[model samples]
Target: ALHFLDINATEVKKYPTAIQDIIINRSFDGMIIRGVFPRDTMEQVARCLEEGNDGGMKSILNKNEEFGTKVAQIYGHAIVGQSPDLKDYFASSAIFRQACRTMFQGSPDFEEQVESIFHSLSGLPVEIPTGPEGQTYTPATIRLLLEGREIAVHVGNDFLLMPAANHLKTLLDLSDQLSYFIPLTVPEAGGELVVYSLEWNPQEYAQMQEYMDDVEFKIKSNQSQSVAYAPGPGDMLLFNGGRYYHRVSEVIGNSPRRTIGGFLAFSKQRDKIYYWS
Candidate 1:
């Protein structure tokens, strides 16, 4: 069994203070930001994601990251950006550096994990044009967003292996453990966003087993409702992927569906090589 909460822009202006007043001021195990843009931001974001337009995506991501990091920093976590190895290039800005300092509490091991993830991407051959002449190109991978802050860890196709990967899994687990501590709130918009909590209750599992047995269940049948459903632009979802298997529903409209997902892991690092292995 799970509960849901809804908050809108009027609430964001009041934010943590408003959040604190309503939910006993504890950290949420997980959260989702769901709502349609007052403008056509959803359509624009979908186009950027689909086209792989780094510049456009970077702009939107940076703004979200700034907001997310600030909120996390205020709530008590240091956040930092992963530096690119290239000397001529500037590393992350001060806001991110301060955020990192607060979030990691000066943990060298954590720093190393973050660095290794980004450096590993350098080994991948994917290239993007660097200069106007198009004479030079550089390797690039998918960007990982933490609480809205963008980290430079390039997890080529192998994102699951990064140290941050497991950390992300941990974040997700934390959401489940503390689900009740924090109220689950989402912004209301046209699209629907569903959040699932897979609390490991013996009774619930047993009931599920009985239902499956009677229905001749397959692996697909075991998937959580989140996985069976589809999502659209402006729709956000947070679920316990570790405990409850879930997925995004098939998109329907002509407009593309854009989604930004982040995870906090709590167990062994997710096996990066599982896909290949």
Candidate 2:
């Protein structure tokens, strides 16, 4: 069964321990924190992105590269599976983290503030992970899904099997991986995140592969149950992206979907939570 929790940011501040219980226990498939960032903070971040997108943002996958069957032109310097090497990945991560800081300059330290909130909810020390080579992973990434684009259906745990994630596979807990994001802006319509009820398993990869090849077919044919969420600006969503197959539906309208977010997982020992874009 799938479960979800919706809580206000104020309640998170007043009864953090109580909120922490639900999260740490893994009682829900997803949790939405309303108004995680105030209006001003969201506007400040959005302004920085709008002003710098022309120069700073990059497409993780080009139009020629297909995610499943569709070409998902995601604009961001995402770390997983995209970086060529550890040295290059770490170097670029430094630049990316710096860029994120610059976006939030004169406001709060974006990374630190996010870590604080996650720490409070999970009751675990949340931190930017370091690579075996002594270099750090990026804390977050600003993703822009332009109109008509979408993130094709896929499972997040598959990332650990990729060549770029070789080092992380051994150091982190493989039980589950989570996706966390806060939308700074949303399109006029659509752009909802749809998650399937089906659990991902390696033994069932054939069925999984079929769905990935044509997600809309499965959804439209009622092959699996699913849940869809369209969170408003400043709202944070923490969802189980590892065990479940999920994807962002096509964004509609002239405005593109704008978000700052990343993935996080617990260390093998479960004492520390590591996050990266």
Candidate 3:
């Protein structure tokens, strides 16, 4: 199930107008609904923003769940609703395992590959975030094992309460069937995150590598990059996280820029290890 919530019509308009346009134009698999509640009704929901604590956010989320679930049901009806085949496919326990096998051609150590890649790029040690706060960020990883099948790692510190393993496997299988996977990050901060699609060229990677070297050179040269600024309350941008090459524009203003991101993978093997113990 899926859920969406907002404070007012004007604020909510961003989702249906701009957000929905991007998702639809991109041919996303999700659906959207409009004007589910009056501004006043939503205002009450928005009041939780004042709590400004994790518990407050959880309470707000819980309160909104009933409405959100109902909206999901409505959206589902508009889409596939309740097809038996679809339901069965979603209900199947082996979906992820099957997807993993299909994608990797056998079992592959996907977790190790992803971790290594991430560490290589960021130059930062990879440690799964834990605790209640960590739950907001960490997601399962799926990878192709040496044998060519898929394997998953359910890392970090969250209670394994759902069929996350099966769901992730299903996602992997679908991604493999589709032949492409895009990693996405949603904004936790206010500013708009613009996504630009640059032509994928080996030269660009070389150029980027050179630019990084230049930045390093500048550090040694004692030359400072230009500074720019802007005021707070920013627009959020969402982009395909895994496949696309992207970046964030220099933040302006006194407030800090914050964000939350998630990743998804597709493979043929159905490994439950990625989702649960």
Candidate 4:
């Protein structure tokens, strides 16, 4: 059966806002919100990165299973290798991987450009959480994920069906991180985000490989409901990126569309937020 949201959505007291909105309002797909940062800060940061930056930021291309071709005009090095099972993804080029790690260690310009947007939320004064080391996130956090159409051969990213509810390491961990995007430089047209509410597990696709190999098939099969939104520069979008299938809609024009984005987790100690890219 294809279920879009939780059945007990009407009893708002029983679940997090994350669960309610998806069922009641169909808001999970694209919950767009207006300006979520200081105009000066976002403008300053975008200007700095758009105009210039250190060698830390570069355009590179990579492909994947569900996503197909992902072009990172500005990206971080292989940051997921921290997981023992995923170490092989970086095994082929440990020598160069270490070299790139050496490069992004300390980038002042890249740091200043994102601290305003990524470090804290303007909507709520919630203190963002720290890294696994209990240290505040720095420029050296996980490799950055970026897209700028000006130089991109592929102007958008594809769909990855990940949901926090089932994928968490432990069910007792009641809360999970929500992915966010704050735009600094947006395109004159296009570059919208499409969020969908359908439970599509990557493992199942692996089982159905005979016919589930196409990106088009994956999109249509899981896309029971969807909504798209394109925010202007200085605007921010908040949603359960993993709980819902999402894609950065194709970016158009050459103006360059960039964003400061990452996953946010709430603290158990206080009403604060924490995150890592």
Candidate 5:
């Protein structure tokens, strides 16, 4: 079943148990908080990215980049698993965090607001995680997807197994990772998040290539195997992206789909919540 909790900001305090179900207990698929921020605040953040204000926006990948194949032209700093090494990831992490501060200087502080929401919903102490070397991880990143672009179908679980994440092995409980995002700009059409019914596992991961092939065939033949969500500006969508096979549908109109978000996990002690992009 593609069931998820839907609520407005005012109803937040009334659903702590249900929020825990989705964010911590994994009893549900996801949740959508309507009007998480004022539309004007969302617009302000969108304008900053669109204008590339204070160098806050830059291409993470291009046609001539190291990959050579142009996986996707994302206009934002590269996130954790996307970076070549831990050092490179942390270097950009510094810049991306600063950019976020500068971009939201006069506007609402996106990270703070989001952290507060997490505390209220999951009832956990939220903090930006630091690496074993004492380097701070980025709490979130801004992503701007232009027309014709889309995030490829993927799962966040593999990040825990990557060598680049070695430093995080001791500090956090990486069992269940959740993805959260607030759309600052919504296009006229498309840009829907499609989450499939299937969840990832180690056995299937060992034969990922074949599993993906079967997944693609099933998705093509059976439309009911997934649920799609198209949230508007200021709406927050939190989901189990680490377990689900999910992707963002292509942007169809001239407007770009811009957002601020990242992934969340619990500390090894389970007493704190940590987030990174």
Candidate 6:
């Protein structure tokens, strides 16, 4: 049986320094943390999003179908300086940034709601944007609300990723940044994350799309040496998305997977980390 470490932020502080690095480095392919909710907070989030199917929560789907299986409210712009190609959809897009605020602030006390859930734990102080000169003024971080299946993405699959070589240029390199996923709700089954291995090459990265579509390739490849992780509601996962190739399986039940995903950045010298959408 494959092994995965299960721990949470509230408990991570007790780990020694060297040990902490191992977990954050995706040292074991990826790390998972479970049970991070106050009884009250989890229920509050569900109430706001449960009705999304019938005149439910309105959300933005992913802009590029080739890039995501699900849609989400992006909190930050594409950093035009990072990827000029994103000019149409993300080039200094005010709408992109605004959408984040709309998701967290527009809801009824939702801003406070998130602050309660993420602020103390998952909140990574947002770092200053390399392109923009307003780190001092910008809020520490933003949010992304990834809605559930059918309305967003399908089951039995992993998210579509633009090979790192093609990752939009930005202040921080993809691997250089740490990422976190806080799931509020998960389907009954088929939502596990499998972290696969791939070299920093284009051809190899490009071929994996075929693996998702072809069973033989997926198995022959084994997508080999991959690690699996399943997160429960209110669980927090910290992983190095930059180096790992991971995917979420399909939702098998009626309830869709609802998660608050954010990318966190680390400062050079210390074990410091900052977060944002």
Q: List the residue pairs that clash in candidate 6.
A: 51-56, 62-71, 82-169, 124-275, 155-250, 156-250, 219-222
TM-score of model 3 vs. true structure? 0.26
* lDDT tens readout by residue for model 1, 66-155: 333211111111112221222211122222233323322333222232222212311211111132222221111122222322121111
| Candidate 3 regions with alpha-carbon error over 4 angstroms | 1-137, 140-191, 199-238, 267-277
**lDDT digits (tens) for residues 1-277 of candidate 3:** 1112223223432443322222223433211222222333223322322233222222212121222211111100110112323333232212332322233332222233333333332233333222222221122211101111111111111111123333333333332111111111111332332222321122220232333344334334543222111111211112222222222333234332322122323233422112111
Supply candidate 6's per-residue lDDT for 216. 36
The candidate scoring highest on TM-score is 5
Judged by TM-score relative to the true structure, which candidate is superior, 2 or 3?
2
CA-RMSD of model 5: 3.5
Which of the predicted structures, 1 or 6, would earn the higher lDDT when compared with the native?
Answer: 6
lDDT of 5 by residue, 38-105 (tens): 79988876677667674444533222233222123443344434433467666667777777777677
TM-score of candidate 5 against the unseen true structure: 0.85
lDDT, residue 268, candidate 2: 90
lDDT by residue (tens digit), candidate 2, 99-139: 66766663666787778778777677888888887788877
For model 2, how big is the CA root-mean-square deviation?
A: 3.7
TM for every model, in the order presented, reads 0.33, 0.84, 0.26, 0.53, 0.85, 0.58
For candidate 3, which ten residues in a row score worst on lDDT?
A: 72-81
Backbone Cα, N, C clashes tallied per candidate: 26, 0, 42, 5, 0, 7
For TM-score, candidate 3 versus 6, the one ahead is 6
Model 4 quality (TM-score)? 0.53
Q: In candidate 4, what are the lDDT values of residues 157-179, reduced to their tens digit?
A: 11112221121122112343456
Stretches of candidate 6 off by over 4 Å are 1-3, 16-27, 51-170, 173-176, 197-222, 267-272
Worst 10 residues of 5 by lDDT: 61-70
Could you report the Cα RMSD, in angstroms, for every candidate shown?
A: 16.6, 3.7, 19.8, 9.4, 3.5, 7.1
Local accuracy by lDDT, each model: 0.26, 0.70, 0.24, 0.40, 0.70, 0.42
